[model samples]
Target: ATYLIGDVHGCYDELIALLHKVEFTPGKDTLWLTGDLVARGPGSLDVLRYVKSLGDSVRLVLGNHDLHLLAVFAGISRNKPKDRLTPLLEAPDADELLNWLRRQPLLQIDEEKKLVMAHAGITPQWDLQTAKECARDVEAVLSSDSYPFFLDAMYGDMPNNWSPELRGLGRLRFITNAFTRMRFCFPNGQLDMYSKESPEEAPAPLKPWFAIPGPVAEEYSIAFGHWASLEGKGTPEGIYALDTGCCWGGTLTCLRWEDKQYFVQPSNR
Candidate 1:
């Protein structure tokens, strides 16, 4: 069976419970995650270890918090006490685990299923091909020895609009933000880095990335997280909002892609 689970946010027990609910067998059953695998939960380290142990059975995209963790580890950002990540940060295997994390993709696609997964939804500006290329561009940098430079320079929300002519760090930053930190976008496909309210609550001219008209809406399905407020609701056809906000006292949701059946586990926090 193939299952796509939403942002974990380090809710290890919930993840385990949700997996058990679906009778997941690591090698036998593939697991796809929407990322934000660490932060604000009780077992970030345990979650990392368990996922890492699965090896080839697990695939994931990097969420904003995941990138933040990388930044903190690289000494480019400060460690926040509220994130509850000290345990993972201080783990003896921290280097190994983080190194593995930095190599993860910003987007994952199942061509057979005609589906794409990113931490946040894809920006409305790009087609499927553009999205894949953009993701690869940033993935190469993250996996290279010069990742710290990208991490340090990746901060801020400048150049919120995408342009084919964009070059250097500006281009990479736009790609990274669209993949990992986006939620809302203007009608013209420019990111609204500040607005995070649910669609019904968002002010005029701001729409969820999926709500904007784009080539992606016509060709493929999108599975994403990062907006816990949606609670798996409010998206249009071909769009899957999977972050049910388990770490925020909601349920951890898993979508069995083979049948489109949902399995949910309530938060234990």
Candidate 2:
């Protein structure tokens, strides 16, 4: 069976507890993470090390923080003290960790279970095939020798909407943003990245990506994280969320897809 988890955010202790609570047996059960596995907590380094050690049992979709950490580690972005990701940056296996992280897919489709996993919600504008292609473009650059160059161009606000006309880093950034950091968007699919408040507090013009009427609702089940303010709520019926905000003193949540059962462990920190 498959177990889907939300943003980890460096809460290694909480993660371990949650896994135990779910009776996770690595070889018997698969663990799928919605990413953001590091940052914003005390044990970013330990979290990466542990998750990496999990090897083939764990499948992760890359999140915004995950990409940001890679950018900082590659010197394309500066490390901010508030982020608490420095320990990972200085770890002995930092190179290996970054390489592994960069190669992670932005989306996963489980045809047997009809499950689609991404770090953030997908836009209604794209179907699974388009989304997969977009993700592939970003993955290609991130896994290449020119990754640093791509990371250098990664940060920007232009090309705010998705279009077939978009090219180069703009296209990659658009894909990354939609699959990683996106929460709300305008009616025409323009991203509203400035807002980080809960969905209830979102502006009148902005609505959660899933709220948009699209094929995602009619076509498949989606699982995502990256929005801790929701506390694990999602708009679509099949869209499961696991970010219970363990790093923020909330519970860490995990779901066993095959059984449709879930487990939660309280945060001690």
Candidate 3:
């Protein structure tokens, strides 16, 4: 049995509490994350160390905030306002932690259960096979000695649509954005990065990524975070939105695969 935990966002205490609530026993039960495991909360340094300490028992994908931290590490972008990553950046073990971050995947899928986890929702255009292939391409570059090159060129919102013909940083950027930063978009693959509201309150034409029916979703179940606004519910079935905004005074959520049960811990704030 495995439990899929939502975005931690450096909210270490809530994460500890939620894990306690589940009585997580690392020896047998696997723990999965929707990423954003760092940033925007106190004690991010400890959070990283604790998660890293868990080692093989945990699986996490890269969230947008996670990438933002790496971009700052590579001197790609200035750390923006409200960012709470300094402790992690200045830690003596910063290099070790960030290197581990670089190696983590953008996707964790369970074929038998048909569960697919990404930091953000998988695009409607991509089937699981296509998603895996694209994930490997970006993962290879991100895990290499030349990762600095990829990080340096990471910031951008251009080329809003994907094309197989895309080459170099262009290709990698699209893949990363889709897996990490995406939320709302039209069924046509036109993403709306501007809105942060939940699907109910979000403006017209743009639907939650999973709301739009397509083969990508029909073939597999999706477990994702990144959108705290969704409050652990996106639209219909097999698509789980688990962030629940623990970093922003909401709550920490966890879903158990075998039992089809959810456990939550309200924010300490």
Candidate 4:
């Protein structure tokens, strides 16, 4: 069977415990990670190493933090000395780890379980094929030597919504923002990136991505993370929010896709 999990955020111990709680045997069971596999905790390096060692049993979708880490490692982005990521950047296997990470898909579709996995919520505007193509555009650059150029253009606020008119890095940035860091959007799909507060308290004009009316929910079962404030809850029916804020002393959650069984391990941080 297959299981889906939320952001790990470098809580390596909690990840191990959660896997044990689910009785997950790497060779026998598949684990799909919604990403953010590193950063913001003590063991980001260890988490990366461990996950990489899992080989084919694990599938990871890219998260905003994951891309940020990669950019920093590639020297495309700078970090403050106080950031907790130094250990990961200095790890002996950092190059290998980063290469492996850059190769991961930003989205996954399991037709048997009808599960669509992404790091952040997918909006109503795009169907699965469109979403996959957007991810591919970014993934292509990320896996290439020209990746640093794309990373340099990664930060911005324009092209806030999907439009055919967007070009160059604007198009790529918009796609990355929506697929990784998005939390809420205007009715017209303008993103609100500042707030990390719960959806209940978001301004009236903003709504969770899944709440956008469309064929998304009716067409597929989506599993995502990135909004720790959701605490594993989602607004749209059949949409799963697996992030329980493990980096914030909350639980690391996992769901077995075949039976819809849930398992969690409390954070030790």
Quick one: best TM-score, which candidate? 1
Query: With candidate 3 superimposed using the best TM-score fit, by how many Å does residue 96's alpha carbon deviate from the native?
Result: 0.7
Per-model TM against the reference: 0.98, 0.96, 0.96, 0.96
User: How much is 243 displaced in model 1, in angstroms?
Assistant: 0.2
Better of 1 and 2 by TM-score: 1
Q: After superposition, how far is residue 66 of candidate 4 from its true place, in Å?
A: 0.7
Please, what are the lDDT tens digits per residue for candidate 4 over residues 1-269? 78888999889889988888888898899999999998887788989999899999998899998998988987888875544899889878889999989988888888877778889878677777788788899989889978888888888876787876778978988988888988888897678778778989887888887888646567889899889999887465689999999998988999998888999888897
Q: For each candidate, what is the lDDT?
A: 0.91, 0.84, 0.86, 0.86
List of clashing residue pairs for candidate 4:
none
Q: Model 3, 208: alpha-carbon shift in Å?
A: 1.3
Which residues of candidate 4, in runs, are more than 4 Å off? 81-83
Clashes of each: 0, 0, 0, 0
Once fitted onto the true fold, the runs of candidate 1 whose alpha carbons sit more than 4 angstroms away are: none
Candidate 3 clashing pairs?
Answer: none
lDDT of 3 by residue, 160-228 (tens): 677778887777778888898888887697667688888889888888888777677898888899898
Poorest 10 consecutive residues by lDDT, candidate 1: 211-220
